[PDB]
Amino acid sequence: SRSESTIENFMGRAACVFMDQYKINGSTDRFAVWTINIREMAQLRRKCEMFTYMRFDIEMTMVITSCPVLTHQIMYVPPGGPIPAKVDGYEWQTSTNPSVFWTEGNAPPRISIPFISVGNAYSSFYDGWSHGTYGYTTLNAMGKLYIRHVNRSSPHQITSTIRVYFKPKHIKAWVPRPPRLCPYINKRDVNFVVTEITDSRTSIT
């Protein structure tokens, strides 16, 4: 009767973790970056922060709109990959960086990322230093997701908005952890404001 209380049923469901737009013609506003992390959405972050160590594969499904036939390149760089600094940068042509070519009107593109960490599990919490900077390790680095129009130009001005749906797959988790009481201040650190344990009451009876 508790089948749905499993980690796969709990953690594994797609959520719209990244909203961004990118123009087709005109500098740095012509592509979208999104360094992949589990700390983007505050609702998904509270779930991944119940476990200290997690191990899962990633299946992403991009949802691209627009405002000719438009073709989009969604290039995924591995954690050691070269990052483009301009829409025309040579780094888009790298063979090592897998990319999908999706033209508008078809089913949305789907790309699947394995467990790419150097260690044995991703860390939700890191009590330690890089040297440095506290709470950051390069073991839970999952790459970036560079997205652009492959079209050279358009007579009209076209602005394309992309939604990324992040779904963990084959989730494995270790070391349970209490759910977070305080709200989130920043997306990189664990800093908090001292909050009350629970809503108050008039008396003890």
Binding site: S5, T6, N120, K172, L181, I197
Partner: protein
């Protein structure tokens, strides 16, 4: 080739689908799995762990350690010691525990809640406290006599320091659990009169949870 018909539902992105997907890097050889202690296969393994219940969550002190401490010993016997609604969801006493925070992810849950009361007073102190549970339909007892004429347990504090009780029919007007001075805290000249009681709520080994939803805690 083979004759094929595309049914309705082709070329759609159902967000909750479970299709096999083409991997970005098939060549990549994943790191072999390693044994890490604490494998979590179910979330009711989290809710089955006892956690301290902030019964004393009065308006003044819910940002200190005094929210957990039930003050006993200083002290009329007419008014109960404490009283709180039993349901974990939508009850400020059990709303934010290991048990309650897991149950706020699920629309429907049915099970039993186990309460454990720990007496944190001196070893020389002694007395009796009457813990009464009233069924969901029934009204809260007004006196110790009406609480005695029901489902209760007279807990001798000098004898044993922990009192465990498993409450049934906790699922979604719920049950009320109360405590009464049956006997004042009898103390020698050396030991301090005022004592504290801690509570521990956890799953009573069932807890089926069916319809997962979004937590009402994070905005």
């Amino acid at each position: 080739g083979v004759p094929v018909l595309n049914t309705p539902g082709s070329n759609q992105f159902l967000t909750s689908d479970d299709y096999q997907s083409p991997s970005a890097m098939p060549q990549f050889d994943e790191t072999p799995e390693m044994h890490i202690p604490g494998e979590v296969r179910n979330l009711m393994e989290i809710a089955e762990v006892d956690s301290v219940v902030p019964v004393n969550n009065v308006t003044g002190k819910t940002k200190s350690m005094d929210a957990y401490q039930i003050p006993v010993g200083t002290t009329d016997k007419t008014k109960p010691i404490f009283s709180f609604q039993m349901d974990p969801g939508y009850s400020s006493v059990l709303k934010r525990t290991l048990l309650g925070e897991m149950l706020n992810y699920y629309a429907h849950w049915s099970g039993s809640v186990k309460l454990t009361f720990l007496f944190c007073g001196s070893a020389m102190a002694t007395g009796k406290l009457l813990i009464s549970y009233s069924p969901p339909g029934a009204s809260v007892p007004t006196s110790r006599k009406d609480a005695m004429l029901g489902t209760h347990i007279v807990w001798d504090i000098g004898l044993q320091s922990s009192c465990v009780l498993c409450v049934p029919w906790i699922s979604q007007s719920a049950g009320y659990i109360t405590c009464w001075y049956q006997t004042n805290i009898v103390v020698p000249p050396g030991a301090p009169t005022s004592c504290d009681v801690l509570c521990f709520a956890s799953a009573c080994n069932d807890f089926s949870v069916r319809l997962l939803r979004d937590t009402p805690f994070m905005a």
